[PDB]
């Protein structure tokens, strides 16, 4: 669903993917989207 680095950032901060809004190409959450939340 998201970018590999985004998933890495979410797993550390325990952030759920269904919480971050992806702004990457198509339906993809960029690592900058995670640190945005």
């Amino acid at each position: 669903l998201a970018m590999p680095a985004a998933e890495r950032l979410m797993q550390e901060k325990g952030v759920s993917p269904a919480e971050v809004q992806g702004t990457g190409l198509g339906g993809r959450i960029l690592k900058e989207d995670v640190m945005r939340h």
Partner: protein
């Protein structure tokens, strides 16, 4: 009438035509030259790359091959040119094949606007109409009044691709991509090559660090490169020509290539009849959808703003027709790579450091040298590097630049990364085959990401 009428059959026009056909449009294309393909296929990318690829192999054989001895290397210019011509011929025939396969109608002659929706084919006298019109007239060599080009002794890139013999001395006016590529081609074959550049650096579209590295590499190879030199005149002579420089110095050579740029081409188009005009640089203004001031008329490629590259023109052609049919369309200019096909290759994708500094964008730099690459070492290469520029806060890749063997091929991955709005971490974490030159990009990305 046609759904779409395309003027010009270069990378922009022929790709636009094919995409338009795939979308269900009835397309007609007007081209004044006998063969399709435009500048790129007829006298640009294709013939130049044929010469660059083949001369590089000959050059390496003359310099010497690791693990072997070569008693002699004899140039066969006719055979070299025959290969070039055969490749161009195959490519042009390919486009003709694709047009016929896709049901694209072709008209031969100079297209001229009669009105906003009607175009005249000068030679035939045909008056064509269409719902949408796409101007893809391309460019032409820039020839200042002081450069007395006679197309024999003082030439443009077109004639430099077909010299009847290796020149004893070739002076290249302009240190841009065309000047360097063609200068390198003939230098490899034995010509004494002198490149004269007005600015303090060569290759104006590359990242500055890369342009400087390139200048150093080419000088080391044997080309004379003089920057900060303004050529004031080029005049044909008996069996050669003279080049005058600001200050009074005069140089002489049997051949002189004038490569000080290329300009948008719209001659004979009668743009005024469609209510259109060109700006100070000869470009046709277009909006965010590649539409001109006249809604149903679009313009793409070298005739409009942006890098004069074949794939840039093709991408705009696709975006233009998709907008016509779907009302959308987009070109990711930040992911468009620019490559100089010398050896080492030179490449750029995204923003240069100069562009980031000018926009006040905070960024991190990750750099990895070819000297640290096992694959490069194995090949006998040690010169070059790849640099990754990433946002200091988001780590998003902003640009990738490099110089080195096949760096253009390596950066194809960088272009994809930018297309996907990837971060330096994303690229650095991706799997890369070992030992390969792509690892240089991977390490550069990791360095940018981990940059303190």
């Amino acid at each position: 009438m046609y759904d779409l009428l395309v003027i010009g059959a270069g990378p922009g026009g022929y790709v636009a035509a094919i995409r338009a056909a795939q979308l269900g449009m009835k397309v007609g294309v007007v081209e004044k030259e006998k063969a399709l393909g435009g500048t790129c296929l007829r006298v640009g990318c294709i013939p130049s790359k044929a010469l660059l690829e083949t001369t590089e192999r000959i050059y390496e054989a003359k310099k010497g091959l690791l693990g072997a001895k070569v008693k002699g290397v004899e140039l066969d210019l006719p055979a070299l040119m025959a290969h070039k011509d055969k490749v161009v011929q195959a490519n042009t025939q390919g486009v003709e094949f694709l047009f016929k396969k896709n049901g694209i109608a072709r008209h031969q002659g100079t297209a001229r606007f009669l009105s906003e929706r009607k175009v005249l084919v000068e030679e035939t006298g045909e008056e064509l109409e269409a719902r949408y019109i796409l101007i893809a007239t391309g460019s032409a060599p820039l020839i200042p009044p002081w450069a007395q080009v006679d197309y024999e002794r003082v030439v443009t890139s077109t004639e430099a691709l077909s010299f009847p013999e290796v020149p004893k001395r070739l002076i290249v006016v302009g240190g841009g991509v065309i000047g360097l590529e063609l200068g390198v081609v003939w230098h490899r074959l034995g010509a004494e090559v002198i490149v004269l550049e007005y600015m303090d650096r060569i290759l104006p579209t590359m990242d500055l660090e890369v342009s400087r590295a390139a200048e150093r590499v080419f000088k080391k190879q044997g080309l004379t490169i003089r920057t900060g030199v303004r050529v004031t005149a080029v005049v044909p002579e008996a069996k050669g020509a003279r080049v005058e420089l600001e200050g009074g110095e005069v140089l002489e050579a049997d051949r002189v290539l004038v490569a000080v740029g290329r300009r948008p081409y719209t001659e004979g188009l009668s743009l005024e009849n469609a209510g259109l005009s060109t700006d100070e640089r000869g470009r046709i203004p277009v909006d965010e959808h590649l539409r001109t001031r006249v809604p149903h008329i679009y313009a793409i490629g070298d005739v409009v703003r942006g890098p004069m590259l074949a794939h840039k023109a093709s991408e705009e052609g696709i975006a233009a027709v998709e907008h016509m049919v779907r009302g959308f369309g987009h070109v990711d200019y930040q992911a468009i790579p620019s490559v100089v096909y010398t050896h080492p290759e030179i490449a750029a994708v995204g923003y240069t450091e100069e562009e980031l500094k000018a926009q006040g964008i905070p960024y991190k730099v990750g750099k990895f040298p070819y000297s640290a690459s096992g694959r490069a070492r194995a090949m006998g290469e040690t010169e070059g590097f790849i640099k990754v520029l990433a946002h200091a806060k988001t780590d998003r890749i902003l640009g990738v630049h490099g110089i080195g063997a096949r760096v253009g091929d390596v950066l194809a991955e960088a272009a994809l990364a930018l297309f996907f709005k990837a971060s330096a971490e994303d690229l650095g974490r991706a799997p890369h085959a070992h030992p390969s030159l792509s690892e240089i990009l991977k390490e550069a990305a990791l360095a940018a990401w981990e940059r303190p």
